[PDB]
Symmetry: D2
Subunit: 244 residues, 4 copies
Amino acid sequence: MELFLAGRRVLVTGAGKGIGRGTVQALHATGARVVAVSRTQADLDSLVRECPGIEPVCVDLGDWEATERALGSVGPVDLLVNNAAVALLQPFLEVTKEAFDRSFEVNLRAVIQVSQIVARGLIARGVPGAIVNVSSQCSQRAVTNHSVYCSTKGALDMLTKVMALELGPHKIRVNAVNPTVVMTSMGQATWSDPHKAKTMLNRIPLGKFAEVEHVVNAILFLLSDRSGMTTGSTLPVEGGFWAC
Amino acid sequence: MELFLAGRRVLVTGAGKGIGRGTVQALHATGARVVAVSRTQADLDSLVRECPGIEPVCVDLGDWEATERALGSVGPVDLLVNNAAVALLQPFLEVTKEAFDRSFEVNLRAVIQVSQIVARGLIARGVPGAIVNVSSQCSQRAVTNHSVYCSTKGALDMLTKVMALELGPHKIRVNAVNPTVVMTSMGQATWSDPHKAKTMLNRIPLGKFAEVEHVVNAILFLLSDRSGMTTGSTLPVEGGFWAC
Amino acid sequence: MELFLAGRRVLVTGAGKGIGRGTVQALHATGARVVAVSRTQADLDSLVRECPGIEPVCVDLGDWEATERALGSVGPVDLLVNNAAVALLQPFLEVTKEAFDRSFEVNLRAVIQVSQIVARGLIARGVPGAIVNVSSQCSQRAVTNHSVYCSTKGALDMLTKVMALELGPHKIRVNAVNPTVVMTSMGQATWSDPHKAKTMLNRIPLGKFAEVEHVVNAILFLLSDRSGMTTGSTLPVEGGFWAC
Amino acid sequence: MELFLAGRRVLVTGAGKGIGRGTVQALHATGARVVAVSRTQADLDSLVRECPGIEPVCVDLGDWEATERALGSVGPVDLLVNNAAVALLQPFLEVTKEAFDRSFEVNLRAVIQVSQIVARGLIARGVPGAIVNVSSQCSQRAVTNHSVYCSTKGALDMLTKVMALELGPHKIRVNAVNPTVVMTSMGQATWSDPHKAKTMLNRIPLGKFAEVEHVVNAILFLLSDRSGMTTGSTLPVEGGFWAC
Ligand SMILES: NC(=O)c1ccc[n+]([C@@H]2O[C@H](COP(=O)([O-])OP(=O)(O)OC[C@H]3O[C@@H](n4cnc5c(N)ncnc54)[C@H](OP(=O)(O)O)[C@@H]3O)[C@@H](O)[C@H]2O)c1
Ligand SMILES: NC(=O)c1ccc[n+]([C@@H]2O[C@H](COP(=O)([O-])OP(=O)(O)OC[C@H]3O[C@@H](n4cnc5c(N)ncnc54)[C@H](OP(=O)(O)O)[C@@H]3O)[C@@H](O)[C@H]2O)c1
Ligand SMILES: NC(=O)c1ccc[n+]([C@@H]2O[C@H](COP(=O)([O-])OP(=O)(O)OC[C@H]3O[C@@H](n4cnc5c(N)ncnc54)[C@H](OP(=O)(O)O)[C@@H]3O)[C@@H](O)[C@H]2O)c1
Ligand SMILES: NC(=O)c1ccc[n+]([C@@H]2O[C@H](COP(=O)([O-])OP(=O)(O)OC[C@H]3O[C@@H](n4cnc5c(N)ncnc54)[C@H](OP(=O)(O)O)[C@@H]3O)[C@@H](O)[C@H]2O)c1
């Protein structure tokens, strides 16, 4: 199934590691032009060696002012993957103002700002496009010590819906993907305990956590014209965790 | 994106018309071996002329005993699309025992029976597979005169979930697709009035009804290993109707 | 908080045992006039001794023709609790035509028929009313061996929604309550194993199953004018099971 | 139905106007002791005249530091209603950093902080309690120019779920209410146009917007032991808007 992603310009946030990195790798492989945005220079340096031709942008996306300046003259961008996020885990009764603020600045505010920059561009050019927001299984199911992170992802699901409503007339589709634990730096920080992960694994009908490739495939399908009547959705990549 | 559907054996119900017909057409074009099951012989005759080498099975899927007999020695089936359904529309206070019975027999009990036949075969062979159930935007939003139809589709969503739970350990994924109005015989029976369709259209961010191709694309993605951590889901093909 | 249920005429199905029995008991204590409908005569005999002045109607609600005949001259009914149901548990691959048919006949088609009888009466009289459908935590989460039962309850949720839509203009509200395990004959048939119940209990934030009183309280709130802008809803009585 | 709210100490945020004000009025009428928290002194002055004995606290709840200082020695609080919110409406492509920040500080961060203060108190005293979060119909359905406000409410729904999970062991229930337009200063700012409200009204089965009394009744029921197995829920007070 040809997705018709070849030659199109794609911006990926949180491109340094895990899902964002895999997404840049897949897009570069299929002949897309990629803008790779991430917080840590070393991650972008190695990525550009692996994927020659991608345009690295090193910026902290929790910084509205710095984001605007860095994504300033990004150029035409046809397709957008909002993947950058932080998981700042604290028991509810220990949540701090600082962890709340940081989480919403990165996981949600930056989704607004980057998507605005991309959408404005598409509309000015009079051309259709697509946005995928990387949410989570946790966007619709609570997990201990994830009050902030779950709230950002629940917010992100709804944000996705409003964006879909308002951008649909401009032929811009906006979807979310919702993965279970993916063993990456985030995933194997706290799910690295074989029995903390055990209780969750028992709740997953397919009996396993998600690979980066599972998430990337879902993102690519949602970016493509193959999903041309899908907008405002939350596509689960969690092995049936939501079902039971 | 290669879906790896070439050579696999696929059974599609309600193959005679609309979405099921389009699904047969797409699968045959990609090199799958198809078992086309539908109620009306003429539909199947023409489809075999269009798609030489498909195996037609003419049966009324509302008939448990006749389905068992017809789908008896169907052979190895790796993939299953449960698409046959009836939309018997009556105001709630006019709902009849007959309309209820027929609707549940075709729209749900046949999903069980045909899925058992295929699943039992997969388990005997010890091989993975996938099932797609064609649901509806109505599975989750009520529409006047659709009390029975809405209930079958709401049931079918939850059926998809239990099937996902129980078949997951056998590496069989089970997903639903949930289209808005598709202008087919069913779609353009009652949504043929330009203002009955107008109120719904105003609720769709993408400002249009779904084409058969939109639904087939989602089906083919959910059948393929590209959607390998998606099970128990309800993938909307409704232009954003659920979102707003 | 006065619910203004004194003097109103209430019909309750499955009144013989568990939740329906408790509902009759509570309503009779508050001064409602109750029509108690249930399958087994002995259950109704004892309940009328406990609750003198209730009107017993012994009928099998799975029988459309017999229900029509029994609920024929029931008289003015202002409020309706659809509680009768069967839990026929079979592994998915063991589901039978008979179990499916029985389950849908009692759990759903009877909800339609009894609701039509009451609603038609309300509309003829030109007076407002309310209907409560007793659903399940299973309406929205799959449980092994509950493919049929889960599907009836998933259907019943969506039925509640269409009924709410169509009856709203007649000032008739229609809501569902969705309890977790309630230790009654149904609840303590299969959840009687202390470790089968253990895995579910660990998923309930309140760390316990529901008492009959919990469910009756939610029913009575949804019947009263206190819930006057609530219709089409699914009120969980599951200790937080859906939330996590 | 006695709710057993008499004599218990209840804190209500956004008590100055609309739903929060009605809630203080109802609680004061039933004999509860009320802490009334709101931004504008004049609103609290008049409230205390209407409801002698309530403890006014004038504070901007978007200010973490000022909140901590003001709700410092509040005293024992048994029950909590988080109602303060701002609706800062902007088209998606016009959303500003300032409107995002303000909305999340008030609508969500303050819910965290106030609920922490109350919960810590309950736990220190070893006593059960209840929290109700005033969300919205918009928490699960997108509305034009409400991207920020819808995202706060979607976040609030999820927050409610995590809080329910973590506080359930401490016998603290946490629920949300989700009203449609209530004609208050917020409601009749933008829904004051008789045809902007017309499209929404047509989508409401009960054919009307919510009164303050509808919301207050739902809050009281969720605060009471009558809803003793309900936690992590989102109780709609939107006349069936979600159903169709
Ligand atoms: N694995 C899981 O448990 C899991 C589950 C469900 C959903 N998700 C979601 O999946 C997505 C990807 O997560 P992952 O597991 O791939 O995480 P990861 O391995 O931690 O990758 C996240 C990437 O985002 C970048 N990033 C974070 N904050 C940033 C900021 N302020 N500015 C610029 N870049 C920033 C990170 O950079 P630095 O490392 O340089 O900070 C990193 O390159 C997220 O949206 C996450 O919420 C993850
Ligand atoms: N089109 C829409 O508006 C819409 C919207 C939401 C969901 N859906 C769902 O999409 C699927 C496809 O519908 P469609 O629009 O393509 O409908 P269609 O054009 O009416 O085609 C339905 C096909 O299923 C077959 N079928 C029906 N009952 C059968 C039975 N008892 N045994 C064997 N075959 C049977 C029909 O055969 P005969 O014609 O010979 O009876 C027909 O070939 C269904 O599951 C439907 O509910 C459709
Ligand atoms: N308890 C749980 O675990 C649980 C959990 C989630 C949801 N629910 C739902 O809660 C409701 C009440 O169940 P329960 O636990 O109270 O069950 P129960 O203790 O088994 O009582 C069910 C009552 O309904 C009656 N009934 C069943 N079929 C009938 C028929 N065809 N015609 C007339 N009466 C009939 C039964 O009569 P006979 O006994 O004479 O057959 C019995 O009096 C149902 O809608 C059930 O699905 C229960
Ligand atoms: N009516 C609707 O359209 C509608 C619909 C669905 C849900 N809701 C929700 O219902 C709840 C009540 O809204 P309403 O219609 O009653 O609104 P309202 O009439 O505007 O009342 C909101 C109250 O909250 C107070 N408040 C706002 N920000 C505050 C802050 N930073 N610190 C302290 N107090 C603050 C307001 O004070 P000032 O006026 O002094 O700022 C006011 O007294 C909210 O959670 C709202 O989101 C409203």
